[PDB]
Design a protein around this ligand. Structure first.
Ligand SMILES: CC[C@H](C)[C@H](N)C(=O)O
Ligand SMILES: CC[C@H](C)[C@H](N)C(=O)O
Ligand SMILES: [Fe+2]
Ligand SMILES: [Fe+2]
Lengths: 370, 370
C-alpha cells in the first residue's frame, strides 16, 4: 500500500520526536522537522504535507497552521496530517490518517447543521490508534486555535467498537428484555448510522441554549458540569429523534435507542475508581428518571416506562430553567445551582469534593468488569 | 468443607438481602436477618455468628456490634463475620472470611506498634473476593465506630497478586537494570513478607507527625491531600528501612525495594481516565525526585541515583515543615500549602480543578495497558 509507506515514514519521524514535546513550538526544532517532512520520499509529495511544511517554516512570525487547516476544512482530500498537542489525547504528536465520510440524512444535515465530520478511520499513524482518541478538534493542532467554522472529526468506528464491546453486553445484563428492539442484533452498518446521527445532533446542540460552548466553556469544566453539558445535548438529541417529524421514523427511533442506551449504560460506568464526568451525569440521569417515573427497577433490571419521553422533556426543561438565569445572575451563581441539582441525584462526598459510583452501577462494574 | 458449607450459607443469605441496604439498620429487617443466621445449619453454630446474632437483635437500643468486635479484636479464632457498610468497599454486605497470620519481626512489632493485622485470606464470601477490597477497617461494620485499639486487617495476598500482575512488568519495562535486585524473581512468600512490613510501617506512621489521622482525617480527603498523606507515611517507612539498624538487614532492604517500586510504579499509574489520589501523589514524588537529583531518566528508563536516600529525607522534611505550621496557622491554611506544593510537581488543570496523568506515565499506561 502507498498510504502504508506514507504512514511508516510518519511513524518513524513520530518516534524520533517523542521526548521533544517541550520544543514543539521552538523554531529550531520546527525547521528540522519541516525539512525531514519535505525530504520524506512518499510523505513529502503529499499536498497536505507541503501545507504543513509551509506552516511550520513560518511559525516564528505566524504561529498558526493555516495552510493545513485550509486543506482539511475544504476537504481537498480525505487525509489529515499535522503536529498535535492535546492534553487529553496525550498519544498524539506528529500524526497522519485517512478517513471515509458517512451517508447523511439531508434534513438532519440542513436543520441541525454544524461543522461536524463523523468519519471512519481507514489508516492511521500510531497516535491515532489509541482507544482514548475518539475525536479530533481544531485546537488540538499545536497552534491551539478553534474557529467556529473549523471542521470537527468524530471517529465513528471507535464508537461502534465501544458499543459492541460494552453497550451490547450491558443491554443484555441490565435492561428488561425488549428494551431496545431496533438495536438487538443490529450490524455494524446500523450502529454506524445511529452513532453518526448522535454526533451530528450532539455538536449542534452544544452551540444552542443560554450557555452554549465554547462561549461558556470555562464555567463547564468542573467534572459534574462537563458531564451535565454532555448530557444536556444528548437529551436534546433524544427529543429531536422523538419529536421532529421530518426525520425518517425508523432511522430516528434507532438513533434514539442508541443515545439512550449509551447514556443509561456505557457512560454510566466510565471511570475507575471514581466516575468520570460522563458517568456522574449519567448517574444523575439514572436517579432522576427513577425518582420521577421515567424508568423503574424490578429486581435490578431497568424498565423504560411508556412515560419516559415526558420525563426526558421535564429533565431538559429543568436544566434549561437553571441555565436561563444567566440573564439575571452570574455564571458563578448558575454553576452552584447546576451543582446543587447534580448533587441531589448523585453520590457526592463533600469532604473529598468528588463523586462515588452510585451502588447500582458499582455492582454492575463488579459483575461485568466494565 | 465445614467452612465451605458455612460460606455457602453466607453467600446465599447475602444474595437474599442484596437490594436491602436501605434497611440494614431497621430492626424489623435485623430481627429477620438474625433469625436466618441463627437457623443456618452450619453458619448459625459458629461462635462469631452467635455474637453477630446477639448484636443485631439488640441493635435498636445499642447500635453497636460490640460482641462481634470483641471476638475479632481478641482473636478468639481466625474467622471474621459481620454486616458491613463501607462506601468505598461497596461489594461488602453480609460477609465471612477466614484468615491466616504472618511471621512478624519482633523489633518491628515493638518499636512500630499498631493494631495492624497483615493477613492472608484463606476462604471468603463473595463480597470479600472483589479486588477493590484490600483491607478491612473497624468503621466498615454497620455501626460505623472505630477505636484506637481496634484491629485493622490488610489482605497481603491481594497485594502479592497486584505486585505480580502490575509492578513486576513495570519494573522490567520502566526501571534501569539492577534497580531492584532483591525483588527480581523473588517468590510470593518473599513479596508477602516485604508487603507485611510495608503495611505495619504504613499504619504506624499514619498516627505520627503534626497532623495524624484520624484526628486530622477530614482535612486530608481532597484527592491530592489523601494521596499525599499515603505518600508521607510510605516515605517514612522507606526511610525506616534504610535507617533503623535494629531491623534485619536483608528483610529491611527487601521492604525498601517493595515500598519504593510500588510508589514509583504501580501507584503512579492508578486511575482511568484521571489519576486517583495515590497516583497524583506518586507523580508528585516522581517529578520532585527528578528535579532534585534523586532519580534520572536515561533512555526512557528510571535510574535510582546513589543520592536518593538524601533526596527522600529532603522530601519528607519538606512535607513535615508544611504540616508543622498547624501549630501557628489554621488547618485550612496548611491544606492550601500542601496543595500548592503538590501542584508544583503534578499536572493540575485549574479550570477542571482536577489532575491529568503526567505524560511520562500516560505513555506507560498506553504501552503496557496499566
Ligand atoms: C464525539 C463527541 C466528542 C468526544 C465531544 N463530546 C464533542 O462534543 O465533540
Ligand atoms: C493496606 C493499607 C490501606 C489500603 C490504607 N492505606 C491504610 O492505611 O489502612
Ligand atoms: Fe460533547
Ligand atoms: Fe493508608
Amino acid at each position: 500500500s502507498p498510504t502504508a509507506a506514507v504512514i511508516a515514514e510518519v511513524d518513524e519521524l513520530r518516534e524520533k520526536i517523542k521526548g521533544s514535546r517541550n520544543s514543539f513550538r521552538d523554531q529550531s526544532f520546527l525547521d528540522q522537522l519541516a525539512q525531514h517532512i519535505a525530504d520524506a520520499p512518499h510523505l513529502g509529495r503529499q499536498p497536505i504535507a507541503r501545507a504543513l511544511v509551509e506552516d511550520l517554516r513560518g511559525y516564528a512570525s505566524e504561529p498558526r497552521l493555516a495552510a493545513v487547516k485550509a486543506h482539511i476544512n475544504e476537504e481537498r482530500d480525505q487525509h489529515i496530517f499535522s503536529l498535535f498537542d492535546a492534553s487529553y489525547f496525550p498519544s498524539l504528536s506528529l500524526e497522519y490518517l485517512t478517513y471515509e465520510t458517512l451517508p447523511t440524512n439531508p434534513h438532519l444535515a440542513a436543520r441541525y447543521a454544524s461543522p461536524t465530520m463523523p468519519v471512519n478511520i481507514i489508516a492511521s499513524s500510531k497516535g491515532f490508534q489509541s482507544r482514548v482518541v475518539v475525536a479530533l478538534f481544531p485546537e488540538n493542532h499545536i497552534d491551539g486555535i478553534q474557529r467556529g467554522d473549523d471542521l470537527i472529526f468524530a471517529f465513528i468506528n471507535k464508537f461502534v467498537e465501544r458499543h459492541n464491546r460494552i453497550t451490547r453486553k450491558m443491554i443484555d445484563a441490565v435492561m428488561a428484555e425488549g428494551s431496545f428492539p431496533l438495536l438487538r442484533g443490529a450490524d455494524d452498518r446500523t450502529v454506524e448510522q445511529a452513532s453518526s446521527w448522535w454526533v451530528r445532533l450532539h455538536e449542534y446542540h452544544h452551540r444552542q441554549g443560554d450557555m452554549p460552548i465554547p462561549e461558556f466553556l470555562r464555567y463547564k469544566k468542573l467534572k459534574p458540569l462537563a458531564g451535565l453539558e454532555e448530557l444536556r445535548v444528548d437529551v436534546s438529541g433524544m427529543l429531536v429523534c422523538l419529536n421532529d417529524p421530518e426525520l425518517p421514523a425508523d432511522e430516528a427511533r434507532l438513533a434514539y435507542e442508541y443515545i439512550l442506551s449509551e447514556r443509561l449504560l456505557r457512560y454510566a460506568v466510565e471511570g475507575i475508581p471514581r466516575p468520570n464526568y460522563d458517568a456522574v451525569a449519567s448517574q444523575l440521569l439514572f436517579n432522576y428518571l427513577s425518582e420521577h417515573g421515567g424508568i423503574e427497577l424490578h429486581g435490578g433490571v431497568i424498565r423504560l416506562c411508556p412515560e419516559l419521553p415526558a420525563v426526558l422533556t421535564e429533565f431538559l426543561d429543568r436544566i434549561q430553567r437553571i441555565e436561563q438565569r444567566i440573564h439575571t445572575t452570574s455564571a458563578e451563581e448558575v454553576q452552584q445551582n447546576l451543582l446543587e441539582f447534580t448533587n441531589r441525584y448523585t453520590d457526592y462526598d463533600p469532604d473529598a469534593k468528588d463523586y462515588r459510583h452510585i451502588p447500582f452501577f458499582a455492582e454492575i462494574k463488579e459483575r461485568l468488569g466494565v
